[PDB]
Amino acid sequence: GVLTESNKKFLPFQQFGRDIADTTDAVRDPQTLEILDITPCSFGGVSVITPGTNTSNQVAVLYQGVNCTEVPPTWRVYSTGSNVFQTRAGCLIGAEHVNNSYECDIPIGAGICASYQSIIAYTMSLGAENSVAYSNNSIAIPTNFTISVTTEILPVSMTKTSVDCTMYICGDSTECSNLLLQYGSFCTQLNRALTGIAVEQDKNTQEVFAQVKQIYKTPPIKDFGGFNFSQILPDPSKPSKRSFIEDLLFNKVT
Amino acid sequence: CSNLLLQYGSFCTQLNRALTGIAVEQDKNTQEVFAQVKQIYKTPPIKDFG
Amino acid sequence: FAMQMAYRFNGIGVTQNVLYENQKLIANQFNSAIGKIQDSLSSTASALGKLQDVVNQNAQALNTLVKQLSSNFGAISSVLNDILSRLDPPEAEVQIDRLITGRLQSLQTYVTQQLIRAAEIRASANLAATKMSECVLGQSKRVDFCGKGYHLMSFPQSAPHGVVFLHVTYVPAQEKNFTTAPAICHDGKAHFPREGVFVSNGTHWFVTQRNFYEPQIITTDNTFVSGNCDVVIGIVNNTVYDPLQPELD
Amino acid sequence: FNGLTVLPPLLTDEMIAQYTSALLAGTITSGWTFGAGAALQIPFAMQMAYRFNGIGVTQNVLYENQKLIANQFNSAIGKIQDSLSSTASALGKLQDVVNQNAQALNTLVKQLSSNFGAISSVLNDILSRLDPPEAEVQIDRLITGRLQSLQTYVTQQLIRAAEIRASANLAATKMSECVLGQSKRVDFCGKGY
Amino acid sequence: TGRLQSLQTYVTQQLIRAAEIRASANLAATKMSECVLGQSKRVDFCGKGYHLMSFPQSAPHGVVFLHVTYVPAQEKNFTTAPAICHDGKAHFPREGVFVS
């Protein structure tokens, strides 16, 4: 640790001190008989803020909870005089601080976040500011309209996987199986839980989709007042009878 | 201690991954709850609300 | 389908007249929106990230479970066949026990994390079922539940491990500023709009529906009268024309 | 602490206050119109008349009784201040999360002071007092105990985070429906109409 | 160590199950509030059909809701028009539909 001149006073009979869970926070030297306090030297995690290997190979390194004053796995270019920015989430090296502020891509913390223009760091922007013209005898009324179509994606189920407890641990060994038998019924509980998850997976799909009493079929002559549902409706040409949008969705996810 | 700990496989990779997932989830929760405005509206200087 | 859309327009608070007098424009806007959705799905990637994250997490967990099978756990080797091949059972049992303990611990961790993930997926599936019931099988007044705007109708689409909802909404546009008053005074009586709001274009006063600008002359038919002029704050003076008198003449 | 770090939140409290201010200014000056699209201004009395129409009472009643309604609203919001300032334990739900997290972290710290069957709980003491061949026996017990404690902590944190996410989803739905509009769901937005 | 591991497994499983039970209880409370103390427009939230009213009944560890709904029956075929013309003007129903 790092020693410092302690301020707290000891009664003439103690030798050291602690606060919680045997964490020795103080000690007196056996020769000068001076009360010193002990605190650990700084440590923390390291993060990389690359914008992707594709585009550029430039990176920014963040040391979390470390003061900029003291810093020096060598990282030669990052401890010799490069531009260093100190934030509330740590110290940032390799990203210049811009006085502007706007919507960003990569969060850092404490309202500071970074993006690739070089790499810059700046305060997050919540949004644009407008002052609505409020008055006690004024109203705004629409004179037109627009129709918007938006997409919402919701996962309903995952793959049904089953793991054999006995064969995973032992794998065709009679001695291993005999030794494992002494452990009780852990394997039975694990298999039961996995099968329960597997059944819940089918129950989820049944709850989500099976909500029609009958299989309704669209008429051949499609005259819906001008509204065109060709892409949404199933395509008989495709063997799977999926629509255009469904085909695109299935192609994207693999 | 670390050399002996290496014999236990990648347990702590899982531990750190779970904790980082929780940490990201907290920010997602806050952002979903509060950030629901396109623009930062401001009240007029004159307060005459009836 | 046009009559259904008129019913939905009534549902969101807009008179069904507007649909019939703007049917072609509405159809064109819907077709263009569908085309834009198709283009965005075809070109833009990572849109289906929520579906991909679940698959990635499950694959990573399973890969970790498989790779944890190659750990010594303090034993001489991670292969049971090697231990049994070169050791007598009395000392081989000690080596096998450590491997058994390690593998059991790893499998238990896997099962617990899978249970947590399954609970999350079940919650998501329940939300999807509720959205299917309330946004597709009907029209919902819940704000932002079935898209941003005034909900009209939704279309479900199947996904590899999920469901995709296309929410059609009515969004007002091209607003204009007017002068408004709460009530109109005629013959010492306070007149209120039956369904709408009084507006002025500078010199005259009209009645419009609240979501679309359709000015109309203030009459007894589209207003109701209650009380004198003194109580209401913000009254203005105007005439309320009654259709009965011209026909009576 | 020993490897225990706390990550600051991405959104500082000033930004969250700004978001709430934007929400509140928008709902005062526009009603529910800013939720659907662009913010359309409306006199606050007319918005109240619209909401009375929404709950089933004609807008006549608001205008005939505007001063009384304003006084009642002001008195109620003043009583809110009085109750918050004077009475305590109103925020027990928020305090429970902090207490639970602090207690879990404290027990995680205190599990570092247990022998777990070894000769000591101090690893440096074991190293200094004992030769390498025998030190591994104690170190393995220490590793087993500390791994088990850490795994228990992580599992409990995941289970708690699930509940916090459920609460956050409910809060987001209430912000969307109670604040950006007028809801007809019974007891979803307070008690009454 | 064996018995303590078994106990830890039991406690973790109980916590996971209690989370699901709490979710079900929250759903039941919401259903009571929105269907016994009121009438809900949400589709398929309280029964199948057009909801009228609900009645709660106690169960040993749960609740039973009796949902009363309105179901149309005996439909008939007709002919419609979006509007009707008279004296060179377009007429639309106030709250109904034109049939022939």
Ligand SMILES: *[C@@H]1O[C@H](CO)[C@@H](O[C@@H]2O[C@H](CO)[C@@H](O)[C@H](O)[C@H]2NC(C)=O)[C@H](O)[C@H]1NC(C)=O
């Ligand atoms: C309402 O908006 C629509 C488009 O959002 C307007 O239609 C456009 O009008 C311009 C001007 O005549 C044309 O150049 C475009 O081709 C039209 N687009 C479409 C899709 O028809 C419409 O005129 C607006 N109505 C009012 C009353 O402002």
Ligand SMILES: *[C@@H]1O[C@H](CO)[C@@H](O[C@@H]2O[C@H](CO)[C@@H](O)[C@H](O)[C@H]2NC(C)=O)[C@H](O)[C@H]1NC(C)=O
């Ligand atoms: C509904 O939209 C589809 C897709 O835009 C239309 O099909 C297109 O029609 C044009 C002209 O006949 C062709 O050039 C395209 O190749 C067609 N695309 C596809 C994917 O088939 C369809 O005509 C529209 N419906 C109506 C009634 O016009």
Ligand SMILES: *[C@@H]1O[C@H](CO)[C@@H](O[C@@H]2O[C@H](CO)[C@@H](O)[C@H](O)[C@H]2NC(C)=O)[C@H](O)[C@H]1NC(C)=O
């Ligand atoms: C009608 O309303 C519009 C708002 O859409 C007014 O335009 C803004 O009015 C505010 C009043 O505080 C000004 O601060 C803005 O600068 C105005 N915007 C622009 C672009 O000038 C408009 O003045 C109003 N007009 C009338 C006659 O009421």
Ligand SMILES: *[C@@H]1O[C@H](CO)[C@@H](O[C@@H]2O[C@H](CO)[C@@H](O)[C@H](O)[C@H]2NC(C)=O)[C@H](O)[C@H]1NC(C)=O
């Ligand atoms: C406000 O609206 C009224 C009624 O629409 C306008 O008065 C009429 O304007 C038309 C022009 O479109 C003239 O032909 C009529 O002679 C006007 N008087 C009537 C119908 O009695 C008035 O000009 C509008 N004021 C504005 C736009 O500032």
Ligand SMILES: *[C@@H]1O[C@H](CO)[C@@H](O[C@@H]2O[C@H](CO)[C@@H](O)[C@H](O)[C@H]2NC(C)=O)[C@H](O)[C@H]1NC(C)=O
């Ligand atoms: C609407 O018209 C009535 C009567 O036509 C106005 O009532 C007069 O208000 C003035 C205000 O000083 C009084 O001096 C008169 O005695 C009232 N009666 C008459 C018969 O003139 C009323 O003020 C008008 N509304 C507004 C907003 O001016």
Ligand SMILES: *[C@@H]1O[C@H](CO)[C@@H](O)[C@H](O)[C@H]1NC(C)=O
């Ligand atoms: C140890 O001796 C030094 C000088 O030899 C003296 O300055 C110091 O006070 C002594 N400390 C104790 C604890 O005797």
Ligand SMILES: *[C@@H]1O[C@H](CO)[C@@H](O)[C@H](O)[C@H]1NC(C)=O
């Ligand atoms: C990836 O590389 C392609 C070209 O190789 C480029 O067009 C694209 O912008 C890159 N994307 C990122 C995120 O770097």
Ligand SMILES: *[C@@H]1O[C@H](CO)[C@@H](O)[C@H](O)[C@H]1NC(C)=O
């Ligand atoms: C870093 O140390 C200096 C020297 O005392 C101090 O002034 C500064 O506030 C410290 N930085 C932080 C973030 O506390």
Ligand SMILES: *[C@@H]1O[C@H](CO)[C@@H](O)[C@H](O)[C@H]1NC(C)=O
């Ligand atoms: C509206 O505010 C103006 C001040 O700008 C005031 O003169 C007028 O009396 C007010 N009218 C109402 C109805 O509050």
Ligand SMILES: *[C@@H]1O[C@H](CO)[C@@H](O)[C@H](O)[C@H]1NC(C)=O
């Ligand atoms: C309406 O007419 C169609 C075609 O004539 C027929 O298929 C359908 O069953 C009829 N509906 C009823 C309710 O009779």
